[PDB]
Design a protein around this ligand. Structure first.
Ligand code: GTP
Lengths: 110, 305, 40
């Protein structure tokens, strides 16, 4: 209503609100930040490295429903990525050695 | 190319500036286009007198004459011209009109109601000023294209109300300039969507958002302190302290206007980095808007060299 | 490229069974009691 706060704002350490929700494993705050259409770029990599099954399930399952008018336009958040740009989610899941995330990724034709 | 956003709270004058970009930069509304606004003039007139009558209950105001009670019943069901005239000229109705800050009344109400004889003729064709004075809410975006000084203006009119905010985020890409409209005459008014919210504080907090947003670091920020004509009249009867309890200046146009300008310009949190280009405007005055928009265009050219 | 598939068949759990196991994992007593009472 007021446009006061950029929801995709970063911190001094390079984490966003969604990454802070993922690191603390707050599924409620994670889904609440997802419901307002925040930026979701590379958050699945942070969830896979954190080895949270519920966060990986939420990031896999929420990206499909309720996508309307592209994404809201956002600029200059995309420079800082802890994960390398060559990395893909199945490869990082293989590096993490977690079984459930690998199974959920393999089920989706990867 | 110049991407130009018209922003501001509800009823601040955005779409009226858009109407002016038609006539000022182009042949403008045709008789036939004027005729299309007749039903809007009528609706604005009828809805305005209804609003005043309705408010008389909330305000504990009686009709100057008992005979108006049946005119009021007739008005709601609906000869119509006669009924509206008698109501409008009633002393109770006029007492309520005088207190319109205590309810929600269109700015052009008295404009039309005072011209009822003219607008009620069977052959009535709205004048260009009648069109400029019309009130039609603006929901969604109104992108129109115009060319000034050979610039290809891509102009975005958007809804000023808080319900219309969702559309604003999509249009923020590549904005050369924002004209942010503020109704000067709103210090004592409350929002239609929130009657515990003063309109001028709402306009400040948005301007706090829009001026300091990181999307508009390189965008030229133009402030139209609009409805200068209405403000000039109102300031002589409604004190600025309603809005700004700390104000110790005069209730005169020049001093009170200057103070409002200062309050808005103070919201800039990057004053040693960014200008606000402020103009006092009457959006319904073609000559004024042409002069101001010319000046604005010069600022935009100079800022894109 | 290299295709990848589940070589050995693990049957997928239904929505109600997955919700029941998640409720048992989170320790919510009332939801597990409601599911057990609705199971029969
Ligand atoms: N006389 C006069 N009337 C004005 C002035 N500014 C606006 N109005 C009138 O007051 C109303 C406000 O103008 P609008 O174009 O509806 O304002 P807006 O900001 O576009 O409104 P939204 O549709 O809510 O965005 C209209 O009826 C205008 O004719 C002004 O400076 N002088």
């Amino acid at each position: 209503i007021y446009y006061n706060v950029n929801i995709n704002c970063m911190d001094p350490l390079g984490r966003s609100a969604l990454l802070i929700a993922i690191e603390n494993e707050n599924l409620e705050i994670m889904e609440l930040l997802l419901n307002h259409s925040v930026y979701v770029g590379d958050a699945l990599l942070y969830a896979i490295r954190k080895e949270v099954v519920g966060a990986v399930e939420l990031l896999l399952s929420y990206r499909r429903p309720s996508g309307e008018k592209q994404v809201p336009t956002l600029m200059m958040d995309t420079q800082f990525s802890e994960f390398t740009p060559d990395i893909t989610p199945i490869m990082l899941a293989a590096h993490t050695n977690n079984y459930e995330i690998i199974k959920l990724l393999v089920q989706k034709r990867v | 190319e110049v991407k130009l956003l018209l922003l501001g709270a509800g009823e601040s004058g955005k779409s009226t500036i858009v109407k002016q970009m038609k006539i000022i930069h182009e042949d403008g509304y045709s008789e036939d286009e004027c005729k299309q606004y007749k039903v809007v003039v009528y609706s604005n007139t009828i809805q305005s007198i209804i609003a005043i009558i309705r408010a008389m209950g909330r305000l504990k105001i009686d009709f100057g004459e008992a005979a108006r009670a049946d005119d009021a019943r007739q008005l709601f069901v609906l000869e119509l011209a006669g009924v509206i005239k008698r109501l409008w000229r009633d002393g109770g109705v006029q007492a309520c009109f005088s207190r319109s800050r205590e309810y929600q009344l269109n700015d052009s109400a008295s404009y039309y109601l005072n011209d009822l004889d003219r607008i009620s003729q069977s052959n009535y064709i709205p004048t260009q000023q009648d069109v400029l004075r019309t009130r039609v809410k603006t929901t969604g975006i109104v992108e129109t294209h115009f060319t000034f000084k050979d610039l290809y203006f891509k102009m975005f009119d958007v809804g000023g109300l808080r319900s219309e905010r969702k559309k604003w985020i999509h249009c923020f890409e590549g904005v050369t300039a924002i004209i942010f409209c503020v109704a000067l005459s709103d210090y004592d008014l409350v929002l239609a969507e929130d009657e515990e919210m003063n309109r001028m504080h709402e306009s400040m907090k948005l301007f706090d958002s829009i001026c300091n947003n990181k999307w508009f670091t390189e965008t030229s920020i133009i402030l139209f302190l609009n409805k200068k004509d209405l403000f000039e009249e109102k300031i002589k009867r409604s004190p600025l302290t309603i809005c700004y309890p700390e104000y110790t200046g005069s209730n005169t146009y020049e001093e009170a206007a200057a103070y409002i300008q200062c309050q808005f310009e103070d919201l800039n949190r990057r004053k040693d980095t960014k200008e606000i280009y402020t103009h006092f405007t009457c959006a319904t005055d073609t000559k004024n808007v042409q002069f101001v928009f010319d000046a604005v265009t010069d600022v935009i050219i100079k800022n894109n060299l | 490229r290299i295709p990848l598939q589940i070589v050995r068949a693990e049957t997928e759990l239904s929505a109600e069974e997955k919700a029941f196991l998640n409720a048992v994992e989170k320790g919510d007593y009332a939801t597990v009691k409601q599911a057990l009472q609705e199971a029969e």
